[PDB]
Paper text:
We identify a horizontally transferred T6SS with Ntox15 family nuclease effector (Tde1) that mediates interbacterial antagonism among Bacteroidales, including several derived from a single human donor. Cognate immunity proteins are encoded adjacent to T6SS effectors and neutralize their activity to prevent intoxication of self and kin. Crystallographic snapshots of isolated Tde1, the Tde1/Tdi1 complex, and homologs from Phocaeicola vulgatus (Tde2/Tdi2) illustrate a conserved mechanism of immunity inserting into the central core of Tde, splitting the nuclease fold into two subdomains.
Tde1tox exhibited DNAse activity on plasmid dsDNA, which was abrogated by mutation of the HxxD active site (H279A) and strongly inhibited by the presence of Tdi1 or chelation of divalent cations using EDTA. Although no close homologs of known structure were available, phases were solved by molecular replacement using an AlphaFold2 prediction model. The AlphaFold2 prediction model was very similar to the experimental crystal structure; mean Cα r.m.s.d. among the eight monomers in the asymmetric unit was 1.0 Å. The Ntox15 domain adopts a globular fold which is predominantly α-helical, forming a short α-sheet between helices 5 and 6 immediately adjacent to the active site. A cavity adjacent to the mutated HxxD motif marks the active site. A sulfate ion is modeled within the active site, likely an artifact of crystallization in high concentration of ammonium sulfate. The DNA binding site predicted with ProNA2020 (38) maps to helices 4, 6, and 7, adjacent to the active site. We conclude that Ntox15 domains adopt a globular fold, distinct from other nuclease families of known structure, with a structurally well-defined active site that mediates DNAse activity.
Residue numbers in the entry: 172 to 355
Write the structure that this text describes.
C-alpha cells in the first residue's frame, strides 16, 4: 500500500454555491467519484495517463463517448418516466427530461488532466459543479493536479524506491474530499 496524498490546495466550494445546500452535497458526491476514479488505477497507470495528456493533449475520443451517453441517457430516462408515472405524452416527458439534462454533464471520473485519459462514462452530474472541479484541477504547469503528481513522485523515489514493476501493482491513494474548503 501507500501513504495518502491529500490534494493541495483543497478544493473550494465557491461563493455562488453556498446559497443552495444541494451544491455542497453534489460537490462531495462529485469529488468522491473523481477520487474513487483515481484510486482504482495503479501508480504506473495514472502516471502514464498524465504523461500522455501532457505530451499529446486531450483525447478526442472522449467527447464522443460522452455525447453518445447523453443521447442514451436521455432516451433511458424518458422510458423510466413514461412507465413510472403513466404519462403517455412522450412529447411532454421529452420536454421534461431535456430540462433535467440542461444542467447535467457526463462525468469523467476523473478528469483528463487528473489522469483519466480513457474514461468509460456511466453517470450524469451537475454540469456546473463538474466544471468547477474541472477548472480547480488546474493546468499542466500549475494547480492541484500537478501537486498530486509531485507528491506521488517523491513517494516512489525516496528509498527504498519503487520500480515500474512495483508501480504496476500498487494502487493510487489520494483524498480530495476530507479537506473540502467552504469559502468564507
Amino acid at each position: 500500500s501507500l501513504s495518502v496524498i491529500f490534494v493541495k490546495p483543497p478544493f473550494q466550494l465557491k461563493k455562488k454555491f453556498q446559497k443552495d445546500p444541494f451544491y455542497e452535497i453534489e460537490m462531495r458526491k462529485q469529488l468522491q467519484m473523481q477520487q474513487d476514479g483515481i484510486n482504482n488505477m495503479t501508480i504506473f497507470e495514472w502516471l502514464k495517463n498524465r504523461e500522455n495528456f501532457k505530451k499529446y493533449g486531450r483525447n478526442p475520443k472522449s467527447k464522443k463517448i460522452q455525447e453518445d451517453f447523453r443521447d442514451r441517457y436521455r432516451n433511458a430516462k424518458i422510458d423510466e418516466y413514461l412507465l413510472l408515472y403513466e404519462d403517455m405524452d412522450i412529447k411532454a416527458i421529452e420536454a421534461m427530461v431535456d430540462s433535467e439534462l440542461e444542467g447535467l454533464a457526463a462525468l469523467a471520473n476523473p478528469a483528463q488532466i487528473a489522469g483519466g485519459y480513457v474514461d468509460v462514462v456511466t453517470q450524469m452530474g451537475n454540469k456546473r459543479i463538474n466544471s468547477s472541479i474541472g477548472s480547480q484541477w488546474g493546468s499542466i504547469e500549475k494547480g492541484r493536479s500537478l501537486n498530486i503528481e509531485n507528491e506521488l513522485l517523491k513517494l516512489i523515489t525516496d528509498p527504498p524506491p519503487i520500480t515500474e514493476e512495483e508501480q504496476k501493482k500498487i494502487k493510487m491513494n489520494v483524498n480530495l474530499v476530507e479537506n473540502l474548503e467552504i469559502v468564507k
